[PDB]
Every structure is written in structure tokens, then in C-alpha cells.
């Protein structure tokens, strides 16, 4: 599944609702491997709508349990990421992913 380890705590009260836009900064890497993506490097936060199957399961369930201002290490097993197929040209089959995700605001 997805393990969530807090890097910095949020307010512990303001959690995303289903259908709400989450505004996040993230860095993604293969577990004990190469960094493949970082929204911080392009200086523009990433946005997705929760409960719309817009992102991988590990992100859906991981961000759902985070409060505003929280920064966490998400360790996402293959079944909650890109599984046996992988993501063409970037993520190989059976890849465990590690994301550093900070929940900046809700809109």
C-alpha cells in the first residue's frame, strides 16, 4: 500500500475533502534509486482534485490523510503506483516509489 511518514506536521485539523483541489510541492524518486520528478525544480506547485482518480492510489490515500501544512514521506508499493506495467519510459515494472509531498493549501 502506502506508508506515510511525517517530515513536518500540518495543522492537524484541515484535511482535504473529496472533490477538493490539493496544492502540493513534491519530489519523486525510485526507492533507493534515481529522482525522476520534482515540482519544486519548476517553481510551480502541483495541483490535483482528490477522489477523481487523477493520481496513483498511493497519492490518493496518502494525501487524503494529510492536513494543511503537512510534509510527509510517502513510500508507495508497486500495486499502489504503476504495478506490473510501470509508466512507459520513466517507471519500470514493480517499482516502489518514494515521494516527498508537502500539502500547501486547498482550493
Ligand X SMILES: CO[C@H]1C[C@@H]2CC[C@@H](C)[C@@](O)(O2)C(=O)C(=O)N2CCCC[C@H]2C(=O)O[C@H]([C@H](C)C[C@@H]2CC[C@@H](O)[C@H](OC)C2)CC(=O)[C@H](C)/C=C(\C)[C@@H](O)[C@@H](OC)C(=O)[C@H](C)C[C@H](C)/C=C/C=C/C=C/1C
Which residues are the active-site residues?
A: 26, 36-37, 56, 82, 99
Q: What is the largest CA-CA distance in the chain?
A: 39
Tell me if residue 3 falls in helix, strand or coil. Answer: strand
Give the nearest distance from C-beta 49 to ligand X in angstroms.
8
Give the footprint of ligand X on this chain (CB under 6 A): 28, 36-37, 46, 48, 53-56, 59, 87, 90-91
Hunting for cell 519544486 — which residue is that? 40
Helices within 6-101 (DSSP H only): 57-64
Residue closer to ligand X by CB (options 15, 46) is: 46
Give the nearest distance from C-beta 54 to ligand X in angstroms.
4
Amino acid at each position: 500500500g502506502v506508508q506515510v511518514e511525517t517530515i513536518s506536521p500540518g495543522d492537524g485539523r484541515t484535511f482535504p475533502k473529496r472533490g477538493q483541489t490539493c496544492v502540493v510541492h513534491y519530489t519523486g524518486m525510485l526507492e533507493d534509486g534515481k529522482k525522476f520528478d520534482s515540482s519544486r525544480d519548476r517553481n510551480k506547485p502541483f495541483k490535483f482534485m482528490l477522489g477523481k482518480q487523477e493520481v496513483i492510489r498511493g497519492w490518493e490515500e496518502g494525501v487524503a490523510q494529510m492536513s494543511v501544512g503537512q510534509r510527509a514521506k510517502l513510500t508507495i508499493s508497486p500495486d499502489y503506483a504503476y504495478g506490473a506495467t510501470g509508466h512507459p519510459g520513466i517507471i519500470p515494472p514493480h517499482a516502489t516509489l518514494v515521494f516527498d509531498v508537502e500539502l500547501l493549501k486547498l482550493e
